[PDB]
Amino acid sequence: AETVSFNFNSFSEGNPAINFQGDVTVLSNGNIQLTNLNKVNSVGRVLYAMPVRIWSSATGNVASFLTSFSFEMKDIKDYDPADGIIFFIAPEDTQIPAGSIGGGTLGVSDTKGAGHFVGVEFDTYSNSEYNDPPTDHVGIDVNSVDSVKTVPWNSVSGAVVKVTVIYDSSTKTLSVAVTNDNGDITTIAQVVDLKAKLPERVKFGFSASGSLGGRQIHLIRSWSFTSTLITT
Amino acid sequence: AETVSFNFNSFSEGNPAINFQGDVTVLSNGNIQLTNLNKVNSVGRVLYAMPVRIWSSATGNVASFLTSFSFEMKDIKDYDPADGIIFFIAPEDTQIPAGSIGGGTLGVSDTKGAGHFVGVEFDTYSNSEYNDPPTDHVGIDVNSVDSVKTVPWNSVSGAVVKVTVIYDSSTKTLSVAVTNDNGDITTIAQVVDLKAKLPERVKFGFSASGSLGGRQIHLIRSWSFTSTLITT
Amino acid sequence: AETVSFNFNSFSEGNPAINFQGDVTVLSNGNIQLTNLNKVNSVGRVLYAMPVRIWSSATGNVASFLTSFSFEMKDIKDYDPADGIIFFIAPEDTQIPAGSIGGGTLGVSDTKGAGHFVGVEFDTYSNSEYNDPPTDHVGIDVNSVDSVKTVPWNSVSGAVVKVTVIYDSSTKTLSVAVTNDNGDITTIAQVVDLKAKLPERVKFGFSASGSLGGRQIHLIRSWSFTSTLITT
Amino acid sequence: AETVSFNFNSFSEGNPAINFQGDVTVLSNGNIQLTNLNKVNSVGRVLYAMPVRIWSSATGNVASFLTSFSFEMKDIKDYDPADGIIFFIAPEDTQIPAGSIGGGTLGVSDTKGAGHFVGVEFDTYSNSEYNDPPTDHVGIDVNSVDSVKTVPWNSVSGAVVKVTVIYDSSTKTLSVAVTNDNGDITTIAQVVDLKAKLPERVKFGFSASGSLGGRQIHLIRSWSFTSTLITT
Ligand SMILES: OC[C@H]1O[C@@H](O[C@H]2[C@H](O)[C@@H](O)[C@@H](O)O[C@@H]2CO)[C@H](O)[C@@H](O)[C@H]1O
Ligand SMILES: OC[C@H]1O[C@@H](O[C@H]2[C@H](O)[C@@H](O)[C@@H](O)O[C@@H]2CO)[C@H](O)[C@@H](O)[C@H]1O
Ligand SMILES: OC[C@H]1O[C@@H](O[C@H]2[C@H](O)[C@@H](O)[C@@H](O)O[C@@H]2CO)[C@H](O)[C@@H](O)[C@H]1O
Numbered sequence: 001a002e003t004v005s006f007n008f009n010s011f012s013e014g015n016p017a018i019n020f021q022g023d024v025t026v027l028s029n030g031n032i033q034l035t036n037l038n039k040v041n042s043v044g045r046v047l048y049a050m051p052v053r054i055w056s057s058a059t060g061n062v063a064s065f066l067t068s069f070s071f072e073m074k075d076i077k078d079y080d081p082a083d084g085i086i087f088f089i090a091p092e093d094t095q096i097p098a099g100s101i102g103g104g105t106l107g108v109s110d111t112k113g114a115g116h117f118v119g120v121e122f123d124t125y126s127n128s129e130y131n132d133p134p135t136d137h138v139g140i141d142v143n144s145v146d147s148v149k150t151v152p153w154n155s156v157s158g159a160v161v162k163v164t165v166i167y168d169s170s171t172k173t174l175s176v177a178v179t180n181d182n183g184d185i186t187t188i189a190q191v192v193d194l195k196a197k198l199p200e201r202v203k204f205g206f207s208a209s210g211s212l213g214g215r216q217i218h219l220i221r222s223w224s225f226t227s228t229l230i231t232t
Numbered sequence: 233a234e235t236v237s238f239n240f241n242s243f244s245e246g247n248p249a250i251n252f253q254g255d256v257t258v259l260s261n262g263n264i265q266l267t268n269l270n271k272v273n274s275v276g277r278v279l280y281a282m283p284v285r286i287w288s289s290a291t292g293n294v295a296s297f298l299t300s301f302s303f304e305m306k307d308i309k310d311y312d313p314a315d316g317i318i319f320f321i322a323p324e325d326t327q328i329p330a331g332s333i334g335g336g337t338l339g340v341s342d343t344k345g346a347g348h349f350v351g352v353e354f355d356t357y358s359n360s361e362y363n364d365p366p367t368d369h370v371g372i373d374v375n376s377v378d379s380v381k382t383v384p385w386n387s388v389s390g391a392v393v394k395v396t397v398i399y400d401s402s403t404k405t406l407s408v409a410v411t412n413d414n415g416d417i418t419t420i421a422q423v424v425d426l427k428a429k430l431p432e433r434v435k436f437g438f439s440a441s442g443s444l445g446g447r448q449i450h451l452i453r454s455w456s457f458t459s460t461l462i463t464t
Numbered sequence: 465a466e467t468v469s470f471n472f473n474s475f476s477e478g479n480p481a482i483n484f485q486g487d488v489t490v491l492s493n494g495n496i497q498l499t500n501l502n503k504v505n506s507v508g509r510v511l512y513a514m515p516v517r518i519w520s521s522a523t524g525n526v527a528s529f530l531t532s533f534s535f536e537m538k539d540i541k542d543y544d545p546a547d548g549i550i551f552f553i554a555p556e557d558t559q560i561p562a563g564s565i566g567g568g569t570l571g572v573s574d575t576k577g578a579g580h581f582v583g584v585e586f587d588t589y590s591n592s593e594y595n596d597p598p599t600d601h602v603g604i605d606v607n608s609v610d611s612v613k614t615v616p617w618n619s620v621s622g623a624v625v626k627v628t629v630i631y632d633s634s635t636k637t638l639s640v641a642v643t644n645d646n647g648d649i650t651t652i653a654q655v656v657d658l659k660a661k662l663p664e665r666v667k668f669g670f671s672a673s674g675s676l677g678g679r680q681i682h683l684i685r686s687w688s689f690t691s692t693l694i695t696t
Numbered sequence: 697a698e699t700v701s702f703n704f705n706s707f708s709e710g711n712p713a714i715n716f717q718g719d720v721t722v723l724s725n726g727n728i729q730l731t732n733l734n735k736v737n738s739v740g741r742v743l744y745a746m747p748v749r750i751w752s753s754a755t756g757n758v759a760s761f762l763t764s765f766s767f768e769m770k771d772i773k774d775y776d777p778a779d780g781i782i783f784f785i786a787p788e789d790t791q792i793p794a795g796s797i798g799g800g801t802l803g804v805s806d807t808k809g810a811g812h813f814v815g816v817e818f819d820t821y822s823n824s825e826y827n828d829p830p831t832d833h834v835g836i837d838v839n840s841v842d843s844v845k846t847v848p849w850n851s852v853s854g855a856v857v858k859v860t861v862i863y864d865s866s867t868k869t870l871s872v873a874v875t876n877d878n879g880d881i882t883t884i885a886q887v888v889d890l891k892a893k894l895p896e897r898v899k900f901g902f903s904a905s906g907s908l909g910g911r912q913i914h915l916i917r918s919w920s921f922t923s924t925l926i927t928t
């Protein structure tokens with residue numbers, strides 16, 4: 001069958017395999033820093049350049065994928081740690097929304113919180129305008145930052161977090177596993193019909209954002225991905 | 233929260249953290265060989281010594297767990313490569329069925345293919361008495377080797393296989409991601425209520441078996457596990 | 465390497481990973497309260513249920529281990545705050561000494577003060593019968609509550625204490641760093657050959673005690689542990 | 697009792713509490729990058745500005761200390777991952793050796809491998825000129841990179857390592873506990889007279905180096921320290 005798979009142990013600006021959008025910047029240690037600590041309403045996104053085919057309109061089949069990545073979020077002096085990082089899937093021509101206000105939109109939606117994407121968010125600030133839970137959380141988003149489902153989580157400054165995501169095409173189930181710093185794990189699952197929400201070709205990536213007063217360090221340390229679409 | 237996690241890069245007889253049942257043998261390279269090549273109807277199981285509490289009768293909560301392990305099956309000169317490996321969850325007092333015929337019972341069920349366990353199998357021989365699909369396969373078994381659900385899969389002799397499992401207590405969804413040697417991934421998910429099928433305290437482990445004519449090498453190379461139960 | 469590791473940010477009765485002996489009791493705040501304030505000569509002990517293999521008779525190797533925990537001792541109205549907490553290591557068959565008088569024996573030794581254990585004690589009452597120093601103290605005990613070595617210390621009521629213990633198998637050196645409420649650190653080191661004083665398999669734990677007129681609150685707030693044995 | 701204690705969760709150039717020497721550099725994520733990947737024979741060092749009094753010529757007492765820190769080392773394309781990082785203690789007037797060839801001297805010793813310092817090195821390259829073990833290692837150095845004692849160790853690219861150090865004035869013992877990423881811990885201890893090797897007031901710091909063909913990322917993520925000297 002059709003299989004797309006890669007593995008980044010460190011990133012490097014200049015690699016044609018990765019699209020850099022917004023305030024993204026590659027540190028000299030291989031980490032990807034998504035936002036700019038000095039800019040207002042900063043929004044940075046990194047995408048895997050090669051578009052992936054998650055479903056064929058010919059066979060009707062949808063792809064199954066396995067992906068895991070590690071990130072870090074650290075507080076900075078005199079700024080509210082906001083708003084988070086989001087692993088998303090969007091049309092192959094996706095771009096930071098025009099006139100993006102950063103903040104609660106996480107760099108993937110308009111002001112209303114709407115957008116054309118699907119993804120797992122690690123939200124560290126509660127936005128009432130988007131019906132955010134009263135605590136840090138992990139949520140499954142489907143064309144909106146108004147999560148379909150969320151689970152309480154805790155973001156620890158300077159802590160490296162590992163995430164594993166499995167998407168089963170048969171059950172159309174997206175299940176996430178978050179391994180916090182102290183060993184504890186957080187999981188959240190949701191049935192999402194990728195074929196009905198996204199186009200045949202999509203791009204996977206990360207996105208982070210901030211506001212005027214909400215800012216923090218968003219880092220992607222590593223990321224491996226494998227998808228398999230049955231072509232028959 | 234209540235977290236239980238362990239990581240095995242290699243095994244060594246003598247470790248109080250591991251129970252050996254049956255024809256289990258520890259190779260000098262640190263790998264565990266589950267069955268005996270010179271015995272008829274051989275059965276070998278290896279369990280995590282300590283029982284794990286997957287759910288509380290007090291709070292009614294179920295634990296979530298993330299676990300990944302790698303195994304290897306290799307053909308030997310004249311036996312049909314059978315019968316396969318199985319990752320299971322069973323009562324803390326779990327033993328190799330009395331008078332086990334090994335073979336297609338995978339060392340966890342009786343002759344009718346019934347038993348008290350929940351598990352993911354890597355069945356390599358088609359047993360029609362247990363309604364096995366015509367090809368090798370991965371299946372989710374619930375108190376029976378007559379899988380509740382299966383997916384076509386291929387066992388490549390001498391190939392190292394990586395498996396990742398996620399159990400989201402919330403949705404009670406068990407998702408499995410198999411990474412074949414050629415990079416292709418196979419996934420399968422199924423909703424199982426561990427709280428309704430298993431007792432509060434259970435044990436996790438692996439089991440493998442063979443017949444008189446069906447024999448092959450079953451190797452468990454590594455295994456890390458983490459489970460978290462919300463206690464409140 | 466054979467590694468055993470665990471981490472407790474909170475405890476909860478029912479966890480198969482923990483063994484309770486004596487007047488132990490888990491508070492709703494997740495804390496462990498070792499003794500019973502209404503019993504005479506009360507003795508409470510908590511142990512990690514799984515036996516750790518500190519040395520191998522095959523290789524002659526001994527394991528190194530790093531562990532840290534925090535406890536709290538708080539005075540109660542008409543009893544002398546006595547007599548302390550001891551972090552011990554004992555044979556896996558360890559039990560509270562028959563006919564234990566509690567008190568200065570800290571729940572690990574007989575009346576003479578003898579026992580089969582190794583431990584770091586935090587003594588809050590001076591027992592001339594066990595050659596206790598005139599002040600509160602931290603001591604390294606080897607098969608007796610008549611410490612091999614002690615160092616002055618000061619138990620502050622209601623104060624949270626953090627302790628870190630390192631055991632280097634090479635030098636057979638056991639070093640302890642106690643961090644008091646006011647920031648100051650107290651340390652004490654001692655060479656203890658664990659392979660000569662204890663059997664291959666042991667259990668780790670905490671014990672506290674009191675007498676008729678000597679009572680106080682003994683709390684265990686957290687406990688993280690890790691040991692690695694070189695298997696080769 | 698005279699206590700000194702600081703705790704850095706992140707570092708930022710411009711902070712008067714920390715001295716910088718060589719090619720040090722503070723990344724936008726708060727990390728300290730000791731070496732420059734584009735320079736030959738690069739040496740970078742970072743010290744706590746305020747000198748700490750470890751012993752007293754008046755009382756004769758020697759301070760005990762507890763200090764833990766976490767670092768990360770990662771491989772860069774087309775370069776041998778060398779030579780390592782070393783947590784050292786030196787005279788308050790300490791400076792990078794004149795005409796420092798970086799490389800195996802780790803930026804603390806001259807070509808012969810001699811210098812006026814005491815430290816724990818995490819060596820990733822085997823320099824035969826300094827009698828290095830054939831593999832990666834941790835070693836206790838006393839005025840020389842020809843470690844008084846060393847222990848096998850393994851540096852994992854991109855992995856965050858946690859170190860804990862304890863110095864017991866009484867026994868003059870310096871024990872080190874290194875927690876690897878896979879959970880495994882490595883320990884090493886040695887008796888060292890800080891009073892006979894160093895002056896009354898010293899400076900604590902970190903140092904890293906590289907050569908022409910040997911380069912890698914040396915990152916210091918966090919550092920907490922507490923030393924107490926009995927003033928009587
Ligand atoms: O505290 C972080 C949140 O900021 C919100 O925006 C604030 C902004 O930070 C503040 O400087 C001022 O302009 O008021 C704004 C409106 O509340 C974001 O909307 C929110 O998403 C957080 O980032
Ligand atoms: O071919 C492997 C399968 O063998 C089945 O049992 C065989 C047995 O191996 C053979 O010697 C003879 O007795 O016929 C039996 C019936 O097929 C097992 O039942 C099956 O699980 C495979 O191992
Ligand atoms: O006061 C604390 C100490 O009490 C000692 O026992 C006392 C006992 O409490 C008292 O009722 C009377 O019987 O005298 C005993 C001997 O002094 C314990 O032995 C000692 O360990 C402290 O707990």
Ligand SMILES: OC[C@H]1O[C@@H](O[C@H]2[C@H](O)[C@@H](O)[C@@H](O)O[C@@H]2CO)[C@H](O)[C@@H](O)[C@H]1O
Nearest residue numbers: 776778779799800821906907908909910
């Ligand atoms: O592989 C790194 C080691 O390099 C040694 O120096 C090399 C140098 O890198 C190379 O360019 C050439 O000059 O040969 C030298 C001698 O081997 C360092 O001495 C050693 O410490 C490592 O850094």
Ligand SMILES: [Ca+2]
Nearest residue numbers: 083104125127
């Ligand atoms: Ca938000």
Ligand SMILES: [Ca+2]
Nearest residue numbers: 336355357359
């Ligand atoms: Ca079968």
Ligand SMILES: [Ca+2]
Nearest residue numbers: 547568589591
């Ligand atoms: Ca006493």
Ligand SMILES: [Ca+2]
Nearest residue numbers: 800819821823
């Ligand atoms: Ca070297």
Ligand SMILES: [Mn+2]
Nearest residue numbers: 123132139147
């Ligand atoms: Mn949200």
Ligand SMILES: [Mn+2]
Nearest residue numbers: 355364371379
């Ligand atoms: Mn089957």
Ligand SMILES: [Mn+2]
Nearest residue numbers: 587596603609
């Ligand atoms: Mn004592």
Ligand SMILES: [Mn+2]
Nearest residue numbers: 819828835843
């Ligand atoms: Mn060395």
